[PDB]
Nucleic acid binder design. Structure first.
Ligand SMILES: Nc1ncnc2c1ncn2[C@@H]1O[C@@H]2COP(=O)(O)O[C@H]2[C@H]1O
Ligand SMILES: Nc1ncnc2c1ncn2[C@@H]1O[C@@H]2COP(=O)(O)O[C@H]2[C@H]1O
Ligand SMILES: Nc1ncnc2c1ncn2[C@@H]1O[C@@H]2COP(=O)(O)O[C@H]2[C@H]1O
Ligand SMILES: Nc1ncnc2c1ncn2[C@@H]1O[C@@H]2COP(=O)(O)O[C@H]2[C@H]1O
Lengths: 200, 200
DNA sequence: AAAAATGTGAT
DNA sequence: CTAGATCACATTTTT
DNA sequence: AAAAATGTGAT
DNA sequence: CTAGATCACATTTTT
C-alpha cells in the first residue's frame, strides 16, 4: 500500500541479528520500530531474572509504541530478535509529525495496540483459567498452524525448546517435559529433541 | 478541556445502575462508550461461568474501543457497572468522523489503549510470577491507596468481598479467606466481613 | 422472605 | 515439599 | 572446547 | 486430592 512506504521512506532501516536485543526494558523511550522483516519476542522478567514471553511480533508489526503517548515513558518490556531482523526506526518526534499530515498511520498503529490488548487479555484468561497441560497444548496448536511450521505426513512439525515453551505458558522447563511426555503417551504428539510433531 | 466537550456534545448520555451490564461479550460491536461518571468492571469468563476481572475503569475512560478498528469486531469481554454510571455513547461510524475533523480524540483514545496494554501485560507477569498471597497482597495495597479507600487510625480501610478479590487475582474464594486470615496473623491487615483495614 | 457471601476440614 | 482447588451444607449477611 | 538445553526422582 | 516448583549434577546437543 502507498501510505506504508511514505512512512517507511521516513525511517532509518536497521538490521539486528538473532538473539540480539532491540529494546531495553525501562530505558527512556523515544523511538518507534516497525518490523520490515524477521521476528522478535517481547518479554518481561522477574527479580530472579526468569523470563516470560508476552508475545511474538513479525513483518508488519510496530514496536516501541506504548511509550509514545506521554512524556518520560519508559520501555515496558525487552524486545529480543527471534530471527535476523530488518526494522524501520523513526523518532517519536518525527513520527508524531507524519500523523498530523496523515492520520491513517496513527490509526494503523492503534489497530495493532487494539489487537494486542485482545491477545494479552486472552492470555490473562488462559493463565487464570487453564492448567499447564491445557496451556502447553494450545501453544502447540498455534505454533503448529503457523507459516513457519513444517509439513509432515502425520501432521505439522515445529521446532522449539522446552525452555522457551515454559516461558510462553509460564511454567518450569522440567514441567514442560513431563507434560510433553504425557502428551506423547496420549499419542497427541511425537517429540524428539527440539522437534515436535503435532499430529493431524 | 475543550475538545472533550465537543466530543461529548456528540454523544447520547445514558445511565446504568450498579450491577447492570453495559457490554455483552461476543456481541457485534458498533458503539464506543466514555464513562462520564461511575465505575465499571471489564470481565472475562470460563466455560463453567467463573469470572475474571481484567480491569476496572472510571470517570475519564473509553470503553468499547477494541472493536473499533476492523469490520465485524465482536466485544472481547463483558462490562458490568461497579457503581451507578453515566456513560457517553456514540456510534463507531459517528466517532470515526470526529477523528477526521479532529485527530486529537483518536490520539487520546490510543493513549488509553497504550496504558491498558501495560497494565494487562503487568497483570500477565503477576500471574506467571507471583503466588496468590503475593497477588492478593498487592491488590490490597492498590485498593487501599485509591480515592474510594477510607481513612482509619491504623491505615486505610477498604470494603470488598473475598469473592471479587478472587476474581481479581485469579484464585478461589476459599483461598482468599485462608490467605486473608494469614495476612492478619501476620498483623498486616485486620479483616471483619467485607471490611479490611490495610495497616499503615 | 431468599439471595449473596463465607467457612469449614478434609483430601 | 506444599501451594491451590474442590466439596456441600449451616452460618452469617445483605437486597 | 564450553555453552545451551534436558533429565532425573525425590520431595 | 494432586497439580507445579525446586534441586544439582551427568547427559545430551549446539555455537
Ligand atoms: N503485552 C504486549 N503485547 C505485545 N507487544 C507488547 C506488549 N507489551 C509490550 N509490547 C511491545 O514491547 C515494547 C516494549 O517497549 P515499549 O513500551 O516502547 O513498547 C512495547 C511494545 O512495542
Ligand atoms: N511462574 C513461573 N515459574 C517458573 N518459570 C516461569 C514462571 N513464569 C515464567 N517462567 C519462565 O519460564 C521458563 C521455563 O523454563 P525455565 O525453567 O528455563 O525458566 C522459566 C522462566 O524463565
Ligand atoms: N484487558 C483489558 N483492559 C482494559 N479494558 C479492557 C480490556 N479488555 C477489554 N477491555 C474493555 O472491555 C471492552 C469489551 O468490548 P470491546 O472489545 O468493545 O472493548 C473492550 C474494552 O473497552
Ligand atoms: N483459575 C481460577 N480458579 C478459580 N476461580 C477463578 C480462577 N480464575 C478466576 N477465577 C474466579 O475468581 C473467583 C473467586 O471466587 P469464587 O470461588 O466465587 O469464583 C472464582 C472465579 O469466578
Amino acid at each position: 500500500d502507498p501510505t506504508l512506504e511514505w512512512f517507511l521512506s521516513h525511517c532509518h532501516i536497521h538490521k539486528y541479528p538473532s538473539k540480539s536485543t532491540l529494546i531495553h526494558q525501562g530505558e527512556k523511550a523515544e523511538t518507534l520500530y516497525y518490523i520490515v522483516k524477521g521476528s522478535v519476542a517481547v518479554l518481561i522478567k522477574d527479580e530472579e531474572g526468569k523470563e516470560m514471553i508476552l508475545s511474538y511480533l513479525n513483518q508488519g508489526d510496530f514496536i516501541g509504541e506504548l511509550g509514545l503517548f506521554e512524556e518520560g515513558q519508559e520501555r515496558s518490556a525487552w524486545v529480543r530478535a527471534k530471527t535476523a531482523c530488518e526494522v524501520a526506526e523513526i523518532s517519536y518526534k518525527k513520527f508524531r509529525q507524519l500523523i498530523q499530515v496523515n492520520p491513517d498511520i496513527l490509526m494503523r498503529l492503534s489497530a495493532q495496540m487494539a489487537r494486542r490488548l485482545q491477545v494479552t487479555s486472552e492470555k490473562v484468561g488462559n493463565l487464570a483459567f487453564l492448567d499447564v497441560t491445557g496451556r502447553i497444548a494450545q501453544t502447540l496448536l498455534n505454533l503448529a498452524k503457523q507459516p513457519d511450521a513444517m509439513t509432515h505426513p502425520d501432521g505439522m512439525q515445529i521446532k522449539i525448546t522446552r525452555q522457551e515453551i515454559g516461558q510462553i505458558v509460564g511454567c518450569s522447563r522440567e514441567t514442560v517435559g513431563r507434560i510433553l511426555k504425557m502428551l506423547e503417551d496420549q499419542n497427541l504428539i511425537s517429540a524428539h529433541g527440539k522437534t515436535i510433531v503435532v499430529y493431524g
